[PDB]
Enzyme design. Structure first.
Site, PDB file in Angstrom:
ATOM      1  N   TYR D  55       0.797  -1.244   0.000  1.00 11.36           N
ATOM      2  CA  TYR D  55       0.000   0.000   0.000  1.00 11.36           C
ATOM      3  C   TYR D  55       0.834   1.302   0.000  1.00 11.36           C
ATOM      4  O   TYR D  55       1.533   1.627   0.963  1.00 11.36           O
ATOM      5  CB  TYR D  55      -0.963   0.032   1.195  1.00 11.36           C
ATOM      6  CG  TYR D  55      -1.954  -1.126   1.207  1.00 11.36           C
ATOM      7  CD1 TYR D  55      -2.188  -1.900   0.046  1.00 11.36           C
ATOM      8  CD2 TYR D  55      -2.623  -1.483   2.369  1.00 11.36           C
ATOM      9  CE1 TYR D  55      -3.040  -2.984   0.061  1.00 11.36           C
ATOM     10  CE2 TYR D  55      -3.495  -2.567   2.387  1.00 11.36           C
ATOM     11  CZ  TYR D  55      -3.699  -3.319   1.230  1.00 11.36           C
ATOM     12  OH  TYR D  55      -4.568  -4.410   1.268  1.00 11.36           O
ATOM     13  N   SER D 209     -13.146  -5.102   1.143  1.00 12.65           N
ATOM     14  CA  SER D 209     -13.983  -4.377   0.175  1.00 12.65           C
ATOM     15  C   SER D 209     -15.460  -4.691   0.333  1.00 12.65           C
ATOM     16  O   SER D 209     -16.132  -5.060  -0.623  1.00 12.65           O
ATOM     17  CB  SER D 209     -13.581  -4.693  -1.258  1.00 12.65           C
ATOM     18  OG  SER D 209     -12.382  -4.017  -1.609  1.00 12.65           O
ATOM     19  N   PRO D 210     -15.983  -4.569   1.544  1.00 15.56           N
ATOM     20  CA  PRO D 210     -17.418  -4.874   1.695  1.00 15.56           C
ATOM     21  C   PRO D 210     -18.330  -3.923   0.881  1.00 15.56           C
ATOM     22  O   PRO D 210     -19.519  -4.192   0.743  1.00 15.56           O
ATOM     23  CB  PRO D 210     -17.638  -4.743   3.202  1.00 15.56           C
ATOM     24  CG  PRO D 210     -16.662  -3.603   3.553  1.00 15.56           C
ATOM     25  CD  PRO D 210     -15.414  -3.983   2.766  1.00 15.56           C
ATOM     26  N   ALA D 212     -17.376  -2.948  -2.196  1.00 17.84           N
ATOM     27  CA  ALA D 212     -16.776  -3.136  -3.511  1.00 17.84           C
ATOM     28  C   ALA D 212     -16.124  -1.823  -3.941  1.00 17.84           C
ATOM     29  O   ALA D 212     -16.354  -1.334  -5.046  1.00 17.84           O
ATOM     30  CB  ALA D 212     -17.831  -3.614  -4.547  1.00 17.84           C
ATOM     31  N   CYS D 213     -15.317  -1.270  -3.025  1.00 19.39           N
ATOM     32  CA  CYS D 213     -14.570  -0.021  -3.213  1.00 19.39           C
ATOM     33  C   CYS D 213     -15.430   1.219  -3.285  1.00 19.39           C
ATOM     34  O   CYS D 213     -14.963   2.253  -3.746  1.00 19.39           O
ATOM     35  CB  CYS D 213     -13.701  -0.076  -4.481  1.00 19.39           C
ATOM     36  SG  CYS D 213     -12.597  -1.525  -4.590  1.00 19.39           S
ATOM     37  N   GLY D 288     -13.190   0.530   4.603  1.00 23.63           N
ATOM     38  CA  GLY D 288     -12.334   1.523   3.986  1.00 23.63           C
ATOM     39  C   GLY D 288     -13.070   2.845   4.188  1.00 23.63           C
ATOM     40  O   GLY D 288     -14.297   2.858   4.190  1.00 23.63           O
ATOM     41  N   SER D 290     -12.562   7.332   3.464  1.00 30.01           N
ATOM     42  CA  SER D 290     -11.716   8.458   3.098  1.00 30.01           C
ATOM     43  C   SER D 290     -11.997   9.687   3.942  1.00 30.01           C
ATOM     44  O   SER D 290     -11.309  10.687   3.796  1.00 30.01           O
ATOM     45  CB  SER D 290     -11.829   8.779   1.594  1.00 30.01           C
ATOM     46  OG  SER D 290     -13.155   9.075   1.205  1.00 30.01           O
ATOM     47  N   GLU D 297     -20.800   6.501   9.784  1.00 31.22           N
ATOM     48  CA  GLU D 297     -22.007   5.905   9.238  1.00 31.22           C
ATOM     49  C   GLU D 297     -21.843   4.380   9.171  1.00 31.22           C
ATOM     50  O   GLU D 297     -22.707   3.646   9.620  1.00 31.22           O
ATOM     51  CB  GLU D 297     -22.288   6.473   7.835  1.00 31.22           C
ATOM     52  CG  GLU D 297     -23.399   5.748   7.105  1.00 31.22           C
ATOM     53  CD  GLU D 297     -23.569   6.183   5.644  1.00 31.22           C
ATOM     54  OE1 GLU D 297     -22.857   7.104   5.178  1.00 31.22           O
ATOM     55  OE2 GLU D 297     -24.430   5.594   4.956  1.00 31.22           O
ATOM     56  N   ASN D 298     -20.724   3.922   8.620  1.00 30.85           N
ATOM     57  CA  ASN D 298     -20.465   2.500   8.440  1.00 30.85           C
ATOM     58  C   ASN D 298     -20.483   1.719   9.748  1.00 30.85           C
ATOM     59  O   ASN D 298     -20.970   0.596   9.815  1.00 30.85           O
ATOM     60  CB  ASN D 298     -19.129   2.302   7.704  1.00 30.85           C
ATOM     61  CG  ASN D 298     -19.156   2.855   6.268  1.00 30.85           C
ATOM     62  OD1 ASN D 298     -18.166   2.771   5.516  1.00 30.85           O
ATOM     63  ND2 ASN D 298     -20.281   3.419   5.884  1.00 30.85           N
TER      64      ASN D 298
END
Ligand code: NAP
Ligand code: NAP
Lengths: 122, 326, 122, 326
Positions: D55, D209-210, D212-213, D288, D290, D297-298
């Site tokens: 990364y 990637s739950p 899918a990005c 993930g 940003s 929220e997630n």
């Protein structure tokens, strides 16, 4: 005197390499033929085959030629194993004979298109 | 065709050509020239460098390490190998006993100014030490992070297999490579005995003296040139071989090979080195070089490799008349 | 060709997973059915069962269908093992027949409350 | 319902949600924002953080370690994981050979300023390295105190089982976790192949990637927003997927799912993440993010989890039309 481990469906057998090199034309006696069955992780040759039969197969090498079928093993299963280990036509013949089987002949017609035709219905 | 290859069946990837340091480093050539050879080699993709506690009484390791430290190359981009066996005049300073493997590797690492080597080799077999002891010592230095892998040098296939079985018996680590002499005039071991081991237990060959110390280069067609290895103080034995009746026969066979070289559009050294790489069982060839010109020429052996057809190989065999019986 | 180790009361057996997958409806051939017997510490399936019988059970898979009872194993113990390993009704029938057992019929009355009554005492 | 769970059947306890650092750390976001995401996550009970030598060419590890050092969190309250495979341009700097596992993990640890990671992962399978070598190297780094456990990433169940059997054969340590891609549009491996391994040898799944990005978030219903991952330099491949015919089909299915989200009283990202956790075989989902809003929220996906009844799951299956056959 390097040792060799042959694993027959989990049943472990060990012998000396010179015991197998005694019969070079068989599967176990030929490096190229047994190579296929070698497990480098465990330093053994593995055969996913019939267990009660192998004893006699290995004793054939140790005895220098004695191929006796174990009393507890069917003649059809044993003979398939003799064939698999490629013990050869001589050992096989010696085996069948001692097992009570000796037959061989058949005189066909001279291929006369005539003689062979008459002989067949007589 | 593939520049890089696995060392035997291990996961270690080495260039098909490596650079050795016997005779040259800390000995015949200057440190400046050694830095120059190593740089040239590294810039051309060569990642394998071989040395030994015995070369120049340890100075070859000192010079190799000085260069690696000065250039700053990332340790992870190099594959450094060293050999242990003759490490001193005292009785306990030679052999493959646990004492000498640990002490010898530790002292080489100090001279190399490296925390570890990628492959440590037993420079030769040791009749006076049980295999178990040797295999446990090699496994020990790997577990201590002093080496990533280990190999054998000048061992018979019987001995290599004994190390492997002893390793399986005690849950130790088997050797992954044998460092064997190999060139057009020394073919037996690599062509007849090692292949079975490669396919059976994954041990690969890392061959040395692919030019038989310069003999196969053709440079000795008319006598011993000045400044050639054969003329160095201490290498009379090599001079004796070249001028001997057998030496003469070799040189005559080399004249026959030159025609093969021209047909393939290459020099004899390039042909000789590529020939060593024609069969899969050889993972890498360790080159020797006393100047930059030699190295730049020898690396060109890689372009020849694709041209060694069965036809050409049969021809070289006819000329050499020494193809070993399988 | 993943290998599988089956430990029968200490007696160790090994075979290829494709040898067992040949008969999906049996205990050993069905991942879900044999899961219960798996020992993750030793990477083997363990069965606290009869030893002399398993040979033949494993040979059934290796042979592709041959189910012969070992001479040294009682017919009642073996048949219980054939049933335990869930070899199926076909193999069982083939076994009994070859073992000398073939019976099947029984014509009852039409369920006449009359016919079935008379037929029973005659 | 249980926020924390065992990673597979090991004794390592992780939060059902972890925070990853791919694309973001040392790349798309500022170190200030990275410190902010990590703090928010840690204060909310999340103890799992995942990174990789690959990364941002190692900078993700540098930023992750800088934060842990600056915050002073107790090392024993964190579960740090990292992945090894692509660690450089040189031939020997990639793969699962013993050389690269040891050197790659050692360099990540240096960039992380940590004595060890809790779980080291093979970032992908390596056809060129014997399983034995890989399993012995992983076992080595654990015995050296460089890692507490190891796992696999993108390996097939066949390969995972091979590592496990090789481990039992040589008395080594088996892997305890597989890091698999998993979301509503990539279900095969986690739902069909991994469960058997979970019940048979205890290997658990840690999915990535739950969303899918970002595709599953719904944010791409009307094109590519500015500053979205799909618009970043270097992620054209993601842009291609979204706008493709298949991409369009996905977005249309997402509109159907929105109604499910409203029935459950949650946002689509929350539903998507909770869906990944509906079955026991999944130990944790790596998120993930940003920015801080996304993370806050997630994390709310945990409140949705109790509502995923068989009825609701069947419905989502009907909409997706991609439930894999067992
Ligand atoms: N495992 C073991 O026991 C063992 C034993 C010996 C060596 N090795 C390893 O193998 C490496 C290579 O062995 P080696 O040095 O004998 O290799 P070699 O390739 O047989 O000989 C190299 C030498 O030949 C000459 N030469 C090379 N290329 C030439 C060219 N294009 N034209 C003219 N002359 C040329 C040079 O000597 P001059 O220029 O001085 O004539 C050079 O020093 C060693 O350095 C060491 O790492 C291992
Ligand atoms: N094992 C492996 O080989 C492997 C491979 C890949 C990843 N991973 C791991 O898995 C972790 C997570 O993967 P991922 O980043 O692909 O995860 P993801 O959950 O699929 O996508 C996260 C990204 O989607 C967007 N997003 C997240 N929540 C959102 C929300 N509520 N609203 C709108 N947009 C939202 C953000 O991108 P934007 O804001 O930029 O649009 C964010 O960067 C990685 O960081 C890494 O640790 C492992």
């Amino acid at each position: 005197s390097e040792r060799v481990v042959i694993n027959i469906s989990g049943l472990r057998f060990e012998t000396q390499l010179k015991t197998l090199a005694q019969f070079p034309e068989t599967l176990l006696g030929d490096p190229k033929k047994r190579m296929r069955y070698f497990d480098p992780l465990r330093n053994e040759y593995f055969f996913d085959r019939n267990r009660p039969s192998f004893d006699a197969i290995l004793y054939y090498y140790q005895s220098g030629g004695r191929l006796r079928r174990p009393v507890n093993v069917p003649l059809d299963i044993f003979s398939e194993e003799i064939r698999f280990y490629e013990l050869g036509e001589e050992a096989m013949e010696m085996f069948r004979e001692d097992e009570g089987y000796i037959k061989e002949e058949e005189r066909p017609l001279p291929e006369n298109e005539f003689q062979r035709q008459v002989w067949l219905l007589f | 065709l593939q520049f890089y290859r696995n060392l035997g069946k291990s996961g270690l990837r080495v260039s098909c050509l490596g650079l050795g340091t016997w005779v040259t480093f800390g000995g015949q050539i200057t440190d400046e020239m050694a830095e120059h050879l190593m740089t040239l080699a590294y810039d051309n993709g060569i990642n394998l460098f071989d040395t030994a506690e015995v070369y120049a009484a340890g100075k070859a390791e000192v010079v190799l390490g000085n260069i690696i430290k000065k250039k700053g190359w990332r340790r992870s981009s190099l594959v450094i190998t060293t050999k242990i066996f003759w490490g001193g005049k005292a009785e306990t300073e030679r052999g493959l006993s646990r004492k000498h493997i640990i002490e010898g590797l530790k002292a080489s690492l100090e001279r190399l100014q490296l925390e570890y080597v990628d492959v440590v080799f037993a420079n030769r077999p040791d009749p006076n030490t049980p295999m178990e002891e040797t295999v446990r010592a090699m496994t020990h230095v790997i577990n201590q992070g002093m080496a990533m892998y280990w190999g054998t040098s000048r061992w018979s296939s019987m001995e290599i297999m004994e190390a492997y079985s002893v390793a399986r018996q005690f849950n130790l680590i088997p050797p992954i490579c044998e460092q064997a002499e190999y060139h057009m005039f020394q073919r037996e071991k690599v062509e007849v005995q090692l292949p079975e081991l490669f396919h059976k237990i994954g041990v690969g060959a890392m061959t040395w003296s692919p030019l038989a110390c310069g003999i196969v280069s053709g440079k000795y067609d008319s006598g011993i040139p000045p400044y050639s290895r054969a003329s160095l103080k201490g290498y009379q034995w090599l001079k004796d071989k070249i001028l001997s009746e057998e030496g003469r026969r070799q040189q005559a066979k080399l004249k026959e090979l030159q025609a093969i070289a021209e047909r393939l559009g290459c020099t004899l050294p390039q042909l000789a080195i590529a020939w060593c790489l024609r069969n899969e069982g050889v993972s890498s060839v360790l080159l020797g070089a006393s100047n930059a010109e030699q190295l730049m020429e020898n690396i060109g052996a890689i372009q020849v490799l694709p041209k060694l057809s069965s036809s050409i190989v049969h021809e070289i065999d006819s000329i050499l008349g020494n193809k070993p019986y399988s």
